Design an enzyme around this catalytic site. Structure first.
Site, PDB file in Angstrom:
ATOM      1  N   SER A 125       0.939  -1.252  -0.062  1.00 21.29           N
ATOM      2  CA  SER A 125      -0.215   0.074  -0.296  1.00 21.29           C
ATOM      3  C   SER A 125       0.891   1.158   0.521  1.00 21.29           C
ATOM      4  O   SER A 125       0.504   2.571  -1.196  1.00 21.29           O
ATOM      5  CB  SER A 125      -0.599  -0.156   1.474  1.00 21.29           C
ATOM      6  OG  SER A 125      -2.118  -1.014   0.355  1.00 21.29           O
ATOM      7  N   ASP A 172      -9.777  -3.200   1.711  1.00 23.03           N
ATOM      8  CA  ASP A 172      -8.215  -4.416   1.902  1.00 23.03           C
ATOM      9  C   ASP A 172      -8.046  -5.058   3.419  1.00 23.03           C
ATOM     10  O   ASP A 172      -7.805  -5.804   2.687  1.00 23.03           O
ATOM     11  CB  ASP A 172      -7.358  -3.361   0.838  1.00 23.03           C
ATOM     12  CG  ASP A 172      -5.901  -4.159   1.976  1.00 23.03           C
ATOM     13  OD1 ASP A 172      -5.023  -4.038   2.628  1.00 23.03           O
ATOM     14  OD2 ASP A 172      -4.660  -4.201   0.656  1.00 23.03           O
ATOM     15  N   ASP A 230      -5.423   0.419  -5.478  1.00 22.92           N
ATOM     16  CA  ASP A 230      -3.951   0.749  -5.421  1.00 22.92           C
ATOM     17  C   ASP A 230      -3.171  -0.568  -5.359  1.00 22.92           C
ATOM     18  O   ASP A 230      -2.350   0.226  -6.333  1.00 22.92           O
ATOM     19  CB  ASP A 230      -3.652   0.971  -3.598  1.00 22.92           C
ATOM     20  CG  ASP A 230      -4.236  -0.358  -2.459  1.00 22.92           C
ATOM     21  OD1 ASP A 230      -5.028  -0.793  -2.958  1.00 22.92           O
ATOM     22  OD2 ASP A 230      -3.683   0.771  -1.507  1.00 22.92           O
TER      23      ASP A 230
HETATM   24 MG    MG Z   1      -5.162   2.391   2.128  1.00 22.34          MG
HETATM   25 ZN    ZN Z   2      -3.490  -1.521  -0.156  1.00 24.73          ZN
HETATM   26 ZN    ZN Z   3      -3.576  -4.533   1.912  1.00 27.72          ZN
END
Ligand code: MG
Ligand code: ZN
Ligand code: ZN
Ligand code: MG
Ligand code: ZN
Ligand code: ZN
Lengths: 446, 449
Positions: free
Chosen positions: B102, B327, B369
């Site tokens: 990330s 996530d 991301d």
């Molecule tokens: Mg984040």
């Molecule tokens: Zn991430």
């Molecule tokens: Zn992650």
């Protein structure tokens, strides 16, 4: 001077470590896109299908073959991109089956109706539906069906057969698994028999094994399907030399290329993924498969020959090419074989794209039928499935995983890209069955 | 003039079992796409990031929440779409690190330079690089930073801090993990300290925990970071009500909403995925979290408040909104939470599309991301990992699998992933592009110099 642009280079424009060095764009694309939008009728359509080539498979192949900052001159050169869903249907309930098999998906785009996994050119009620190839042909266009698999595989067979089960390769299998289709039971016949009747001007691929079977009924009873073809006036070529000697292919003398008993040979050789492979083993470097041959035509050669023979038809043509084994090596947890087939398809897309670029009336689409298992993970990954570490073009290690006998498909939405007239219909979220209507519309059918 | 339209309805047209029943398109898109292209100046930009939201997460959330033939009014409504690569760099070699974390990815789009996993606002040589928010604010544009994760997290942090390690949340950690950044060692400060220095007009999210930390130097030594915030002009808010009462948010009255010690509550609850769970355990139906509270604003609500304030600036604004828990829950192998968070984000995208669609000079970008590990698999599947069968809106079961790990969490993945956009300069997201291109597309769109 209007000419539709193809992304000439979207590789890391510079030094990966430096500011802006990783940019793939060198300026504003708004103009280039406008120059890519056209609603003019498409004269020809070339559809390149990578079996199981989801976004994960594409990124895995680029990384290794061109480097992370690389660019596939074929696969990534298509200007308009989007995402499409490809779910199947539960035959009984009629509800969505979140993960399709090759047969169901192949039907959705070639016929326009959703169906149940395993069906080939029939809906859940087992009703036949005319495929895009049968329609192109009905309207007098040329038709071509090319693949590196057996012409009985789900993707190519989908354009010329209507059976309740993909397993109905020939008379032998059909009698038992598709009795309703069995020729000796009043049906249309096996996939191979139906393929022989569909009569596309050009059909190139492997799967010659089944053509050794004899028909159980009909006008050609007792004759092998290979003999049938000949009696029906087919041009049978079995190698690169003869394939290239063909001067013309049409309805009076249609071409049938059987370049292998089963699937045509894979491009690269390599070890199978293994449990904790990324750690219990050194990085793998794929190596060219010695059986590929100077006599076995490559996918870009079949695409090239078919394009040549098909462009004689003043009216236009429809072509479907399948880079086939990507799906198989994916099922086989063999990273090198999987990656090789992707590179193999890229070369095919390049040819189609160079032609389409000069002709100016071709619609070139590159996509996959369904996503697969392969995932690119961290080097030090300790997964429960099979992993393999590879030496990428960047001189760095890339680890691949297969953790879902063989690896399955997955139902994630995947990339679909196009270039040419009506290619605008692939941008944004669309469904696989949408592809049928986009092509029906571009070609001007009905 | 035909001012750019959003994809009204891309849902299955009718009876999905009949020919053309599952179609999403009604007619030709050519003309629709022609009216969506504009290279004119974008007055504002709104960037909705879905932590770990690849095409796979998007699908599962759609299948579940709206059925396979369903349609996400926000997320799926963006007309211009593409796919972008997000590989990171190996610090020592300078060679590509296929699977990013990330930290490195957030840095990639906020500063336009590739870095190594863990870094924030610095390249492999540890040199700083101005971020899009620092630049935006520098041009006089009002700026906002919103997330549902703790504010020191990679995604929101990458916009305001430059540290050599994401772990450097506050004074304490920084002293031991980012010495060269330690305020005691003349360093610029911990993630939180730099957060306060950055002074974004609107900052909303969780992570009040580190704000309890006390400074070890600077003109505010011995004072807790929260005390410092107030003493510096920040106007604190800790719940929906007070957030709603806030009428102004600017450079001399910046807003700082801390609605949780760590991350905020997840929308939907459900059991963990388990070995062969899809075979040995029933089909889960996600249960709304009883404790998300009317006192805690939702992502959509924070987005709308942020837009309400930020738009009062005549120059224009930059807004990054982060649907964080997808996530984390994806890591947690908690299907329901992962899906709940994608739904939570969709509502936020809808809010933004609403504003942009009206204003007419607002680029809205919806991306992720990096890709995660969850995959949608066949119901009768016997995988080696954690799996769970859910009860989707279609009344059919969908099985999700997590099998890229045998360790504590479910890993990230390096697959190229969807990027969609709407507004002036949206054309720059179509085709293949790199995550760092996002920085240049934004900077150039906003006209930043
Ligand atoms: Mg984040
Ligand atoms: Zn991430
Ligand atoms: Zn992650
Ligand atoms: Mg196939
Ligand atoms: Zn397939
Ligand atoms: Zn397959």
């Amino acid at each position: 001077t209007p000419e539709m642009p193809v992304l000439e280079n979207r590789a890391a424009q510079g030094d990966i470590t430096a500011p802006g060095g990783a940019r793939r764009l060198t300026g504003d694309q708004t103009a280039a896109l406008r120059d890519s939008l056209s609603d003019k009728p498409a004269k020809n359509i070339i559809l390149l299908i990578g079996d199981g080539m989801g976004d994960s498979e594409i990124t895995a192949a680029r990384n290794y073959a061109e480097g992370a900052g690389g660019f596939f001159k074929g696969i990534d050169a298509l200007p308009l991109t989007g995402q499409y869903t490809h779910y199947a249907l539960n035959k009984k309930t009629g509800k969505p089956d979140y993960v399709t098999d090759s047969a169901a998906s192949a039907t959705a785009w070639s016929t326009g109706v959703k169906t149940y996994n395993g069906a080939l050119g029939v809906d859940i009620h087992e009703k036949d539906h005319p495929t895009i190839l049968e329609m192109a042909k009905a309207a007098g266009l040329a038709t071509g069906n090319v693949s590196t698999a057996e012409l009985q595989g789900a993707t190519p067979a989908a354009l010329v057969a209507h059976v309740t089960s993909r397993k109905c390769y020939g008379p032998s299998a059909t009698s038992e698994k598709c009795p309703g289709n069995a020729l000796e039971k009043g049906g249309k016949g096996s996939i191979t028999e139906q393929l022989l009747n569909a009569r596309a001007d050009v059909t190139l691929g492997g799967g010659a094994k089944t053509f050794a079977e004899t028909a159980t009924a009909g006008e050609w009873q007792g004759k092998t399907l290979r003999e049938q073809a000949e009696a029906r006036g087919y041009q049978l070529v079995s190698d690169a030399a003869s394939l290239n000697s063909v001067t013309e292919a049409n309805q009076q003398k249609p071409l049938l290329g059987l370049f292998a008993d089963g699937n045509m040979p894979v491009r690269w050789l390599g070890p199978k993924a293994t449990y904790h492979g990324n750690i219990d083993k050194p990085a793998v470097t794929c190596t060219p498969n010695p059986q590929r041959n100077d006599s076995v035509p490559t996918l870009a050669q079949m695409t090239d020959k078919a394009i040549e023979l098909l462009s004689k038809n003043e009216k236009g043509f429809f072509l479907q090419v399948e880079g086939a084994s990507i799906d198989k090596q994916d099922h086989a947890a063999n990273p090198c074989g999987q990656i090789g087939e992707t590179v193999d398809l890229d070369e095919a897309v390049q040819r189609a794209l160079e032609f389409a670029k000069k002709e100016g009336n071709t619609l070139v689409i590159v996509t996959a039928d369904h996503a697969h298992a392969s995932q690119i993970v961290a080097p030090d990954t300790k997964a429960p499935g099979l992993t393999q570490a590879l030496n990428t073009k960047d001189g760095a290690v890339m680890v691949m995983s297969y953790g879902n006998d063989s690896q399955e498909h997955t139902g994630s939405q995947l990339r679909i890209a196009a270039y040419g007239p009506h290619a605008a219909n692939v941008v944004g979220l669309t469904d696989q069955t949408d592809l049928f209507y986009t092509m029906k519309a571009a070609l001007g059918l009905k």
